[PDB]
């Protein structure tokens, strides 16, 4: 991610931060916060007046989830007077599995094979029905032949 933050106010402050997890429902049976998805090395830095600091955030994923881990807690010993003592920062990390369905097609043409087999079964019906044809024709003949 590499989020950048800029100071102003002619005051130097110690940039520390805390990680508050997403507040999952009472019934949620997931622990997606104890192993930190997002990690940074510039933690607990120092910010001088009129300076910009860039912090590189690396997102580690163990499954294909949104992994909402709202850092949202930057503390500074002279607590900020800019709309709340602690600033907010919303972190979202999305992973994907890249499902492989190339062979999924392979199962399909079976169903065509059974379409063929269904045709065979229906042809059996034609066999049975045409069985009725053969006895019908000869009956009148012998009478007029005699």
């Amino acid at each position: 991610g590499s989020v950048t933050l800029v100071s102003r106010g002619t005051a130097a402050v110690n940039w520390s931060w805390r990680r508050v997890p997403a507040p999952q429902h009472a019934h949620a049976a997931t622990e997606l916060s104890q192993p930190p998805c997002f990690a940074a090395s510039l933690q607990s830095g120092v910010l001088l007046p009129g300076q910009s600091l860039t912090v590189a955030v690396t997102f580690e994923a163990a499954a294909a989830g949104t992994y909402r881990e709202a850092w949202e807690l930057v503390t500074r010993p002279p607590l900020q007077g800019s709309e709340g003592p602690c600033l907010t920062l919303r972190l979202r990390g999305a992973a994907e599995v890249r499902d492989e369905s190339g062979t999924g097609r392979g199962a399909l043409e079976e169903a065509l094979a059974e379409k063929e087999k269904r045709a065979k079964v229906a042809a059996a019906l034609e066999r049975v029905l045409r069985d009725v044809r053969m006895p019908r024709r000869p009956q009148p003949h012998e009478s007029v032949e005699e």
Binding site: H27, L32, G65, G104, L125
Partner: protein, 614 residues
């Protein structure tokens, strides 16, 4: 081209295996475990104020300094152990590598401390992440397919079934795919029956060879009009099933197959007589064994219940041979079970042929469903209790009495509350929660459906379909917080579900996280995203918040999914706002032209005027 005087195996056999060195990681884990136990002791000694006090006291006492020294030595060893690739060594990559080693350190610490974390009295929530190449996802794939079927996500369920089929191609997975194909519909039953055939050919499974017989019995009665020859092989197939167990209840089950077979009443009667003899022998043996230390109707009940588990509604044949058990047996609760079976058959018939619920409701108006086993336990067996439970569920399902969604809510609430009081919440099918939520959504209230989905999730935390439905209902009720919240929980619980990603993208758009919405939409687009309504709402939110290229992409996906739904008008409006796509403007004027509605053609004329302007 002269050949070798020697062979090809002449190169020396060095035979050098490749072992991975990982000792430093284990040393770090052990040292961290010891340090963490000491830290826990200090934590017990002396809330967030407690944590601040503990860090301050550690700094003051200097135990933190010894921590730093020992951990510094350990981390130096770890870095030398793992990170020694080196290379170009640019500063941005250096920051990235520092982040990598820091994340590895925290991962190692968490892995080491997971023992104590689990041992803690707090409820152990296992992390959902199970990244697996289908080596173990089997079984869980069946569960996901079951949830998809419960919600009606047919294509996703079929894809999961085909995935497990490719993974294992075993008899039982073939059987599961065939059963799901049965549940899909009457047309799919041919595929279902031959998947049964594939499983049978692979293995003559005991549970197998009965489903194929059921499909054969379904033939010659199906709406697709199969002939008698299709059901002809059923007798032989179920005779082989009987040979699977020659002197068991499966034989009485196959007696139903003879009964279905025409002009075989003599063989059916002989089979019934010998089945009665075998049942009497078994009962006498049981009585003698108990002393030293009916059944036919129950068998017909179970052999009716299995096709009730299947999608077939033709176990009415099993019912028809049920009660004709010569002489009315002791009614007990078997009669009530038979009445439950015939009610289930009636509801299945109504499902098979639409508009049948109007006459279905005629019987439960009076003297049907045991009045829910006299509406009380009183002096009755647990069979009667579960019969009353199921009767309540069926009555509530019987919407079409007069459409009284209110009494539908009342009886769904009664059913789920009885389940909760008995403690068997998980036993409630997901179809019940889906029906209750749909009934609430039918009325003006959506938050009620949201909370009933939440109740379902509480009952079944493992399932993610309930959470995703909760997210849908929260979106409908416009509670963005809980919407994104439960949708994220559902997505993490079950990935590979495009609906969850699409809903997440919608909520992100509404909250204003444009980049999050783009990512979620892209992931869902890589996945299925069959539902057109989600994409249409995404396009509407985009119309509200710019991003005309995203508008165009989403609406093009809508157009590809569905030809004539006048989404071409939105296509044309978006590319007129873009104002460079006159060719597609004319194309979509033609799209409306063969869409052919009066209002659609008036809008087409307006769009044509706009295109002429552009």
């Amino acid at each position: 081209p002269p050949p070798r005087p020697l062979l090809e195996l002449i190169p020396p056999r060095d035979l050098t295996p490749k072992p991975p060195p990982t000792t430093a990681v284990d040393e770090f884990k052990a040292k961290v475990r010891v340090i963490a136990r000491a830290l826990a002791e200090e934590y017990k000694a002396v809330a967030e104020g407690r944590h601040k006090a503990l860090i301050f006291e550690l700094n003051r006492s200097g135990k933190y300094a010894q921590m730093r020294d020992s951990l510094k030595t350990a981390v130096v060893s770890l870095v030398r152990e793992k990170y020694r690739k080196s290379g170009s060594m640019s500063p941005n990559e250096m920051a990235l590598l520092y982040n990598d080693l820091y994340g590895s350190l925290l991962a190692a610490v968490h892995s080491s401390l997971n023992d104590l974390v689990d041992a803690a009295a707090a409820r152990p929530r296992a992390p959902p992440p199970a990244p697996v190449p289908d080596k173990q996802r089997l079984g869980e794939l069946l569960e996901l397919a079951a949830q998809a079927e419960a919600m009606g996500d047919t294509d996703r369920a079929e894809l999961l079934h085909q995935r497990r089929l490719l993974a294992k191609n075993d008899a039982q997975v073939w059987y599961e795919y065939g059963t799901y194909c049965l549940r899909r519909g009457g047309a799919k039953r041919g595929r279902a029956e031959e998947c049964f055939r594939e499983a049978l050919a692979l293995e003559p499974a005991h549970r197998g060879a009965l489903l194929a017989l059921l499909g054969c019995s379904v033939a010659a009665g199906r709406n697709t009009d199969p002939a008698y020859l299709e059901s002809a092989e059923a007798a032989a197939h179920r005779l082989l099933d009987v040979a699977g167990r020659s002197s068991l209840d499966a034989w009485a089950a196959l007696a139903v197959v003879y009964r279905a077979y025409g002009e075989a009443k003599r063989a059916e009667l002989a089979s019934c007589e010998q089945e009665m003899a075998r049942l009497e022998k078994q009962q006498l043996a049981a009585a003698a064994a108990a002393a030293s230390a009916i059944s036919l109707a129950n068998t017909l009940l179970e052999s009716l219940a299995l096709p009730a588990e299947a999608a077939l509604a033709l176990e009415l044949a099993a019912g028809l041979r049920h009660w004709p058990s010569v002489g009315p047996d002791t009614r007990t609760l078997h009669a009530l079970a038979g009445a439950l079976a015939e009610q289930a058959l009636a509801r299945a018939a109504g499902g098979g042929a639409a508009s049948a619920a109007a006459e279905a409701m005629l019987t439960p108006g009076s003297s049907v469903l045991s009045m829910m086993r006299a509406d009380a336990g009183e002096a009755v067996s647990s069979v009667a209790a579960e019969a009353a439970w199921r009767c309540r569920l069926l009555v509530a399902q019987l919407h079409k009495a007069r459409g009284a969604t209110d009494e539908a809510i009342r009886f769904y609430q009664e059913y789920i509350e009885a389940a909760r009081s008995s403690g068997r919440l998980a036993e409630v099918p997901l179809s019940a929660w889906l029906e209750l939520a749909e009934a609430y959504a039918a009325r003006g209230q959506a938050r009620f459906a949201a909370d009933v989905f939440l109740l379902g999730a509480s009952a079944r935390p493992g399932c993610a379909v309930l959470w995703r439905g909760a997210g849908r209902c929260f979106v409908g009720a416009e509670e963005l917080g809980p919407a994104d919240m439960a949708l994220s929980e559902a997505n993490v619980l079950d990935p590979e579900d495009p609906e969850a990603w699409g809903w997440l993208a919608l909520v992100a758009l509404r909250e204003g996280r444009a980049e999050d919405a783009e990512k979620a939409l892209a992931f869902g687009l890589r996945c299925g995203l069959g539902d057109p309504g989600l994409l249409l709402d995404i396009a509407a939110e985009y119309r509200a918040a710019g991003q005309r290229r995203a508008e165009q992409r989403v609406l093009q996906e809508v157009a590809v999914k569905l030809m004539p739904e006048s989404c071409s008008a939105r296509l044309l409006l978006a590319r007129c706002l873009v104002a460079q796509r006159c060719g597609a403007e004319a194309a979509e004027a033609v799209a409306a032209a063969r869409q052919l509605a009066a209002h659609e053609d008036d809008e087409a004329a307006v769009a044509e005027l706009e295109a002429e302007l552009r």
